Design a protein around this ligand. Sequence first.
Ligand SMILES: *C\C=C(C)/C=C/C=C(C)/C=C/C1=C(C)CCCC1(C)C
Ligand SMILES: CCCCCCCC/C=C\CCCCCCCC(=O)O
Ligand SMILES: CCCCCCCC/C=C\CCCCCCCC(=O)O
Ligand SMILES: [Cl-]
Ligand SMILES: [Cl-]
Length: 264
Amino acid sequence: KNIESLFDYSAGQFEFIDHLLTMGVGVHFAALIFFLVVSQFVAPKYRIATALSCIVMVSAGLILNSQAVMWTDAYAYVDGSYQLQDLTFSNGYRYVNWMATIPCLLLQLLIVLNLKGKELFSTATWLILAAWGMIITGYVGQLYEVDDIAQLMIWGAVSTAFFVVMNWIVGTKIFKNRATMLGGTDSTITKVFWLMMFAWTLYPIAYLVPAFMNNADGVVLRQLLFTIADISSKVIYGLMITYIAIQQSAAAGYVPAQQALGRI
Ligand SMILES: *C\C=C(C)/C=C/C=C(C)/C=C/C1=C(C)CCCC1(C)C
Ligand SMILES: CCCCCCCC/C=C\CCCCCCCC(=O)O
Ligand SMILES: CCCCCCCC/C=C\CCCCCCCC(=O)O
Ligand SMILES: [Cl-]
Ligand SMILES: [Cl-]
């Protein structure tokens, strides 16, 4: 039902699909390694944000590790090419952990927009249901990527709607509680806000791929777009939650953060 399964790829694409998935495991697990260590140095008010990116790294990490392992469990080499045997690839669990990863990835921002208590809990809840509506509508569209490109369009359309809606609430909180942030970080979160628009338009590109390269290296183009989105949605936004997170630790009195910024 997915467009991976339609294709007898050559050999070079597979190994490169094997290879996207593999450094993608490696890079998050290495990112993981690093949000753990500068945990000493966050004020215990943005500490959960850097800790939302140990969760995120081993979330994107398992799924991408599940997938590569499942990418290779899946295809022998037969009379030229790597062919579906009888154990299927499909990008379906990836939406599923975006059910967990999009959310978790938003509160750390919301934590670094210093949302707290009722307005942390209020903003957090609406971003999540908008994320979910986007995620499940999209999940059901790529369900017809072979069978029904028209609903893929239609369901993609609804999913987009929720995206628009959810960026509007992301940026509305930034571009408004911007000045409550400290450390000099009142600045870097509008900037961060545009990287996280770019990598989030990458998936709905990896999503219209079937209706414009219904072919084998269309499958590769699709997986090209995934790795990059995973790299700066999970990992590079996160590195910045910490830059934004450490600069607020430091500037409010956090002695370990003040001297963490000293030998840099
Ligand atoms: C891997 C980390 C993140 C934050 C990924 C998020 C996923 C999306 C933004 C995907 C969004 C969709 C949209 C915007 C509309 C078409 C359907 C999609 C599910 C691809
Ligand atoms: C095993 C397959 C390849 C995966 C291993 C990759 C080796 C590390 C490569 C870089 C990934 C990004 C690491 C995050 C940087 C943290 C340090 C920093 O802040 O600059
Ligand atoms: C900023 C995120 C970086 C993502 C890095 C992804 C690595 C891929 C980079 C370019 C690939 C170029 C190699 C050409 C592959 C040809 C495809 C094929 O075999 O048919
Ligand atoms: Cl504190
Ligand atoms: Cl993920």
